[PDB]
Paper text:
In bacteria, transcription is carried out by the RNA polymerase (RNAP) core (E) composed of five subunits (α_2_ββ’ω). To initiate transcription, the core associates with the promoter-specific initiation factor σ (the σ subunit) to form the RNAP holoenzyme (Eσ). Most Mtb genes are transcribed by RNAP harboring the principal σ^A^ subunit and the principal-like σ^B^ subunit that belong to group I and group II, respectively, and share almost identical promoter binding regions. Here, we show that the stress-response σ^B^ factor from the human pathogen, *[name]*, induces the RNAP holoenzyme oligomerization into a supramolecular complex composed of eight RNAP units.
In the RNAP dimer, the σ^B^ C-terminal domains of the two Eσ^B^ protomers were stacked together and comprised three disconnected densities, determined at a resolution between 5.5 and 8 Å (**[Fig fig2])**. Two peripheral densities (b1 in R1 and b2 in R5) were buried deeply in the active site cleft of RNAP and occluded the RNA:DNA hybrid path (**[Fig fig2]**). Potentially, the a1-a2 density can comprise domain σ^B^4 or domain σ^B^3.1. Consequently, the atomic model of the σ^B^4 dimer could not be fitted into the cryo-EM density without significant rearrangements of the σ^B^4 structure. Conversely, the atomic model of the σ^B^3.1 dimer perfectly fitted into the density without significant rearrangements (**Figure S8C**). However, at the current resolution, we could not unambiguously assign the a1-a2 density to σ^B^3.1.
Residue numbers in the entry:
A (entry chain C): 837 to 1140
B (entry chain A): 4 to 226
C (entry chain B): 3 to 232
D (entry chain D): 444 to 1012, 1024 to 1029
E (entry chain C): 446 to 787
F (entry chain D): 1226 to 1283
G (entry chain C): 29 to 53
H (entry chain E): 28 to 110
The structure:
Amino acid sequence: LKVPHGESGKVIGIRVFSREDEDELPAGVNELVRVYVAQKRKISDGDKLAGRHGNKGVIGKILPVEDMPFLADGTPVDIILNTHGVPRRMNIGQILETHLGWCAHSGWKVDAAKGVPDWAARLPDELLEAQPNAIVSTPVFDGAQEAELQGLLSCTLPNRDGDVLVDADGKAMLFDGRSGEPFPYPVTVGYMYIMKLHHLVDDKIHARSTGPYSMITQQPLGGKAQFGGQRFGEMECWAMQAYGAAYTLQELLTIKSDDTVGRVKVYEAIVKGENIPEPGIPESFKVLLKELQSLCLNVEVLSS
Amino acid sequence: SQRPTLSEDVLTDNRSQFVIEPLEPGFGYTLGNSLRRTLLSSIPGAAVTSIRIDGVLHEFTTVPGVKEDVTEIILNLKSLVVSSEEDEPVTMYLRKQGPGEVTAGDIVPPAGVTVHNPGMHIATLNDKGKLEVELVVERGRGYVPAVQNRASGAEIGRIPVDSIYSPVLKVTYKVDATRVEQRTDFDKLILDVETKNSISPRDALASAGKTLVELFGLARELN
Amino acid sequence: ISQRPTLSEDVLTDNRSQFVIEPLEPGFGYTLGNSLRRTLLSSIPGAAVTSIRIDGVLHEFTTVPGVKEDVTEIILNLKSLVVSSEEDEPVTMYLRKQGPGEVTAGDIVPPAGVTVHNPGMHIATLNDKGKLEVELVVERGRGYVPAVQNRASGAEIGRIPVDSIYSPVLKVTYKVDATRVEQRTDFDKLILDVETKNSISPRDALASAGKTLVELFGLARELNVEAEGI
Amino acid sequence: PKLMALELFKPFVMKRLVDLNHAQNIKSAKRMVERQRPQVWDVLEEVIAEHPVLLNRAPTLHRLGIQAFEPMLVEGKAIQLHPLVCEAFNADFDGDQMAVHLPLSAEAQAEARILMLSSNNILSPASGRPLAMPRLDMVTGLYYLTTEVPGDTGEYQPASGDHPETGVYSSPAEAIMAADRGVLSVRAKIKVRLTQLRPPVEIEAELFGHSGWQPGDAWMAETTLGRVMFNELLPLGYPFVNKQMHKKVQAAIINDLAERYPMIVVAQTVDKLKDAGFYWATRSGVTVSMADVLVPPRKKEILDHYEERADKVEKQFQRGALNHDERNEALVEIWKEATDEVGQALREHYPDDNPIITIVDSGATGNFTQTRTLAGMKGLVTNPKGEFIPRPVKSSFREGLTVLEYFINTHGARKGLADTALRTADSGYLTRRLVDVSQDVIVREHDCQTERGIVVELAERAPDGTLIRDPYIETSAYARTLGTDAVDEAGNVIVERGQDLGDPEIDALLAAGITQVKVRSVLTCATSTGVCATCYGRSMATGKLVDIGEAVGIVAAQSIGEPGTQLTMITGGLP
Amino acid sequence: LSGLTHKRRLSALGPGGLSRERAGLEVRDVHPSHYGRMCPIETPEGPNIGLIGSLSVYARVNPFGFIETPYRKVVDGVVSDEIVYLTADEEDRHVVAQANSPIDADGRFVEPRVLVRRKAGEVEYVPSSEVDYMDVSPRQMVSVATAMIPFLEHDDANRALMGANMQRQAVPLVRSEAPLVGTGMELRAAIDAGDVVVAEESGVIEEVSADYITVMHDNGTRRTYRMRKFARSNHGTCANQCPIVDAGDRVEAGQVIADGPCTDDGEMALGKNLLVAIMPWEGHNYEDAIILSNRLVEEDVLTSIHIEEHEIDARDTKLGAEEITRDIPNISDEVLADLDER
Amino acid sequence: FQETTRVLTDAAINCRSDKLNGLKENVIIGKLIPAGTGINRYRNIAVQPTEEARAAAY
Amino acid sequence: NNSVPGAPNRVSFAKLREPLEVPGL
Amino acid sequence: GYDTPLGITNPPIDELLDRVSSKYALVIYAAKRARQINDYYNQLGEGILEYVGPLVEPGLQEKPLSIALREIHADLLEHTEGE
Ligand SMILES: [Mg+2]
Ligand SMILES: [Zn+2]
């Protein structure tokens, strides 16, 4: 047994079951041994991410830390989201979630010397004074209203430098990492919860140039684990016909799927500098012949 | 009317402010951004490369007597900061036995290296177990994946660790413009930098300045 | 760390140029490009016109008598004139003609030092029995400065400040291209593009900009002593 | 990704490497490639200089679903792609996966390099109009760049007594420098002096007296720096365009460029325009915030009045004169009117600065109904039976719904999901059958020299007006070959026999006032097998007459079957 | 969370049930009787839409098999603290109030007119006296997965369903962090999940270790809990437990002692907290694409662990029995340099 | 397409010899499709450098 | 009102009280 | 009358169509020449120079098909139609 195509990592443990030691085993077996391989994966390109409001996405590019936009106090952001997808999908809740997350993270202190503001009438008496990295919870169908967020965003505790970053509306002034000059208009920022989906990229990526061939169908195996080639649907044949491309279809159907001698000869020619010889008769056609000749139907060729 | 610039320093506990002026209009932003970009990624440093834990064959396991497994201690050790004077892999030791706590100050560095934050908490030990860990300290710049040691083909007892050679932590700048109609139209740059205490801000600024000078020297030569 | 040296290639055209720097460490593409473009655009000293005068007109609403062109057209034509000066103080210059015909920059009498690098340039045309006298001042500076910054200037009759261009280069553009020096296959390839006036060559403008930038970063380097790669 | 290309070009790399004497034999070369020594990367870069590859998004649907791009090494494990080709595959950058093939023989290389290349297929086969155009985001950037605003900084002003007239720049370079300095907004009224842009015909024929513009001729324009910067992207010689760039204007400009210039120039200008739009989209200042979605100011009074009228009709029903059906009809119509009024008020409230308004009005995406739902009223919602519930929602998503309203609303989403689930399969089956029926249609002969040509009314002449363009001339008679010359009333010939029709020729015919035209058609082809090339007329993807041997049946089947996905409900839908 | 949802799933197909093709399309739609029993939001995205629901938060199965739902009966316009459980038939035959309707602290209805749900699809205001039943909480119709999506009253049905389905596909990270904003049904959904141990009796911990813990009961009986470390999960991910208790603390009964995967101090944590910005950036975030800072990569903020699994067996054959052996014909020593003696 | 047995029998009885015409059969066999670059009008082309090039090639 | 003994403290935007704890899931 | 392109798209397609009758003929008209060029390269070591090498001077290790396409644009080849 060998490691399949596209696996690596440490060997953490080995379990071996022996019939000598009086270990129950399936009938007709003597020694079944299983090996566990553990690999640590770091998030990379081609990985899925999505919040709790159903907004999927993929990592288009991972810029250096020195290139991302940074707040006026030098705090580079960690992720940038597109804006055209928010109003069309109509998931405005995530904007409120980001605002509330920023408010909770920065900590707030609502003024009360002159009395509770009208917008803060229903706030719990113990929720008027928070600390940095505070924790807040909004039960479904019963949470902070728009006025509550408006009031809270106007009383966030200042940074240790003495200045407040975001405005009342929640936007802030950034600085481009490439040009180095501030953007003409403010942008929204905040902390939003991000999960990690199971559709990783390492599982998907796969290549196959030459490898084991099936014995019953004379075709390359299938699947990433078996190191097999990809499928070629009939719609692809229709498309190739549409362009009028003929030799390409001939190769795809004959010289790279079935013809054994064709594969050997073309591989050798590529290894050398010789031109690729023309394909031959696909195995499918010859099998069809030798099978239809079995029904007493004399199928001639008429090469003339 | 026309004077060369001058750089002065305003000092604080660990983060220093640098003031540069007078600069021609519309030119402070680009200079500040260039300095910031060359500061956060091209400052040489040193950091732990690979560890060696006695009685342990790999990283996905534990060790009796400790409260957290190998992965947690590796994550904690990533925060360790060290400065290398020699340009070759040096070796340290960490031997602590019995109940109590193990901190960054329990390492016995060899000559030519130092640990500047003895207050870090690595882990804690129960009386049952002990601990002896050997780690390497190489000098590099930027950031390197841990897998670099995978291809070296060492023995089982070697565990790679990601290396992050960067003493700078945060940098920011603001420009104080003077847009009066007088020919005194200039801008004043206010650059602030903070370091991990491995090196003072002046050293990092000088290194970045030298890097940019050497890089731009290729254009001053007559073409 | 020596790493790998970065050589500056070059391409040639009538008056344009495409200077190429290859290879660069990942991320240094913009770090060079932006600052270099700004330095080239607003660092090189130069000379240009600042204000003009027309005794034949009291203000700017109307046009000078006996001339086909308009006052705004005359200002635009005279602004693009390329003037090189070697004297710091602002010197004057006079243009005078009589009778029908045309006027060219080369016909303007230059005082000592100042010179015009384009004598065949057109300014305007005169009809029969036409005349115009102009007294334009020339000053040396750097970069671009609008006439608004020169609004308050003593008291005169027909002083009409004009937006000057104190720079021999007027256009710059650059990009960044990926390159494969090793398995990293991410190294940047700066591609600069400059188009200067007739008073300087692109390569000498670039050399002066590099000189100025290196002198500027000499302050940063001088604070301490420490070396790096080539 | 390099990890894929290296394993995909293994034989070529081995051959070229053994040629360079980096190994001694083939087995050693294969082993070294397996070990991936640093001596292989250079050969790998050298061996794929001009080797095309074939991409295929699964499942391919139409002709343009299989392109042929030049490979380029890049790190990572994701196959990078060009933004403007995603529409061809109808792909969304959210986990879609596509295969990658590779031609081996020298014949397949030329085939994929000439025919299947991406840059030669800007025009969709359905209609002779380009498909790869600014689609989603860069359009917003172009709209922002070309937008005009009054009373900006540095705008043009007239001579005010003792002060000159400011806002005139010698050349675009000076304007760019001024904008960089910070004394000229990118979008303001200016009077620049262009020198390398042909003026519009209205000014070209006047200022130069039709003598003909050439590079080096100056003329005083009146526009904004953004418009000049945009026009600089267009190919040289194109007349200046000085109007705000709505998506319709973008489509018209792109179509005109495709119908007047070769494909390669169109592709180059499209790439440059996309780059400019991406650069200028970021600085448009388009974001989303609570202060952006603004509640209507006086919605409460309108809602109260409509609820009072609803109560009136409720009492009318309580009298017992009316039945349930009449009550439902009254309620539904009243609430539809109320929703319309609230939407009108909400539109009247928002200024022209909110990001939502800027996005929706610029044709970037969405419609006003979504904005009304997000800010105004969601209104009545569908039911599992399809009839509108008598209970309307009185709140927007911004303010916050209630449990009952959400429970009522879920039905529409469920039904839409089911409808899409069935429609995909219906369209697939219809496309398969349509492809099956017409497999053996091919252009055999160059010309059947037949005379029967179907007559189609080009444009009707109004009894009171002079001429009205037919609303379907774009489809019936746009690319067909003219059967007979459409001689004007006089003896002059405006379009000669055999000359293929087109946008300029259609315009010329419209000018001549001709209404009825006989056009050569394929329905009456006299060819024994297949159809002659002349009858078929101008191709779609080529832009010219079809070439002998080209299959047409497959193209027609794909074109007719592709739009089957959106076909929904004597039914009027796909059935 | 995925395991809990699977345990709470309500299938409608399979043996003894209707097939996909024969099942009508109407059954896949909501019914006015679903309120309080089956969540209308949570549902698979695939073709099995509407055939797989989920119990409500407060739903309990009656001994016969008819789902119930708690209610407090208003006797004479005054709310009753005591609650009863009603089935579908009894619920239809009575008047059910609205939980969100304001109610005075003394149980008096401030509003004379209160909205109400009626027999089927009927809602209309009624005097504040005839009303008989009132709901318990506003969250009485949401599922367990959907109950922990903040600001659910602002999103769309399709978006909410998509988010709920996405929440069941997270991957356990190495260093989890509790969300800054999240409903109050996080810790409760984690304690009942079973993947977190908990003390049975209030005792005092004597010593703790990375592999096992020993708590001393107040009655003098010592007990030990063993925590599996780095054991392959049923779906290929990893599972671990890290005690969050110190030596010499009198831990009360019912207090969490260890945190399993996707947990932080006895509460669910399926992700991290990132600083987001909303703006198109050079088209790299074009059409749902995303851009990430290298700080996440170089700080293991979103680093996960995946454990593979392989097995081989040597089964007897008519031609003989196969045996695993270090030696193997015609193989270089280097290839087998890793195999041991066995 | 359909009813393979009946059509096969009918063709066999008549000894219907059919040329490789059309696409579907020609792709089932594997021979070059008689469309696009497959028509005999283009499959048989002889190209050589013009005599002028050869005279001036060296 | 933290039913469990030592859960983390996170104040909530509570306006209404539920008269019964969530039953065993 | 346009900016010089870069990559495999040089020379352009419309220019070539001016020489060849149709795009479907051009692909073979160039592939056969590429085959001849490859054959000449194969025999470069020793043999008969009947398959005259490239007409236009090649670049630095350019594929034979690129050479064929770049020389066809120079109008240096003659061909017979179908049979
Ligand atoms: Mg998708
Ligand atoms: Zn015909």
